[PDB]
């Protein structure tokens with residue numbers, strides 16, 4: 066199907082996975098509100114491994130309770146862009162409502178250029194508890210020119226992560242990235 | 247001056263402190279982009295004290311470099327709403343550009359009701375280093391009805407924090423709050 070705009074999706078009754086898969090630019094604004102996370106999904110830890118070498122690259126964890134939402138800025142080193150197969154172990158809590166079809170679509174762009182879409186299922190989740198999921202990211206094979214542009218233009222690589230439960234958008238996190246660490 | 251809308255501010259060449267002081271609702275969307283933080287301000291730690299008792303209430307710190315931006319969700323206990331004078335010690339780094347007039351305007355709302363505006367100056371900042379500032383929040387004297395509504399309706403209390411450097415908006419962080427911890 067043809068490309069859709071951020072403004073078109075905001076006018077819909079419900080945003081479905083198939084709809085965000087036709088966005089052709091990273092969004093400017095968010096496509097849902099914090100209060101749409103009616104399942105209280107809260108990411109608490111992720112551990113990132115290079116699956117070719119088995120090396121743990123890094124682990125990020127949450128340090129009155131706070132939930133960081135909506136936006137993360139990452140600065141990586143240039144070798145990050147040379148990875149091929151990266152495993153993410155993602156820990157998260159969920160609230161008291163049962164979750165079905167928890168699905169994540171991530172779209173990564175350098176400026177206006179889509180680099181890669183990832184579309185993962187989270188699997189079965191126990192309510193009111195910590196849950197864990199492993200995702201395997203097969204990185205795009207980036208050209209040398211694109212790699213150079215991404216290193217030279219920090220934070221112009223950006224992503225949208227759209228999280229669905231039962232085919233309805235419930236969370237939308239954004240990020241930008243540099244590779245000049 | 248009369249109230250301004252989020253859409254009116256987005257149409258301006260530059261958003262000034264006086265402009266956000268006339269918003270009469272928490273914003274739906276952000277009034278600047280991540281890339282507008284051309285000073286690379288990154289909050290790294292804050293320590294919150296009840297200044298009446300001297301008690302440290304809590305400290306939040308950041309755990310490849312990441313910067314959490316744009317949105318934090320807080321869950322406090324109901325006693326938080328009874329505080330009167332709260333000291334925040336805020337640690338942050340700044341990039342290589344010199345900073346002048348670093349100013350923060352925070353507006354806190356329960357639903358559509360403005361509870362309090364805070365307007366603080368950060369003082370002088372050394373580029374390319376960690377900086378610290380102390381702010382003193384004089385909490386509004388909330389009615390018992392408002393306190394009850396805020397406890398009973400988690401995450402319907404929301405804030406905008408608008409950060410200015412040299413009278414131009416450079417960061418806009420948002421939060422929502424519960425008081426039923």
Ligand SMILES: CC(=O)N[C@@H](CSC/C=C(\C)CC/C=C(\C)CC/C=C(\C)CCC=C(C)C)C(=O)O
Nearest residue numbers: 108111133134135136137153173180181226238239
């Ligand atoms: C509030 C917020 O935003 N929470 C974030 C982080 S918590 C959930 C963590 C997840 C889903 C793991 C994210 C995976 C990684 C960081 C590994 C690095 C791989 C990439 C950045 C893709 C690389 C793509 C290209 C090179 C084109 C989020 O929702 O993700």
Ligand SMILES: CC(=O)N[C@@H](CSC/C=C(\C)CC/C=C(\C)CC/C=C(\C)CCC=C(C)C)C(=O)O
Nearest residue numbers: 289292314315316317318334354361362407419420
């Ligand atoms: C990305 C992001 O969002 N970073 C956040 C947190 S880093 C800077 C920390 C600051 C400015 C300290 C914030 C102060 C507190 C948390 C103390 C609690 C006081 C209140 C919540 C006001 C209470 C108001 C009423 C009861 C009406 C931000 O920019 O703030």
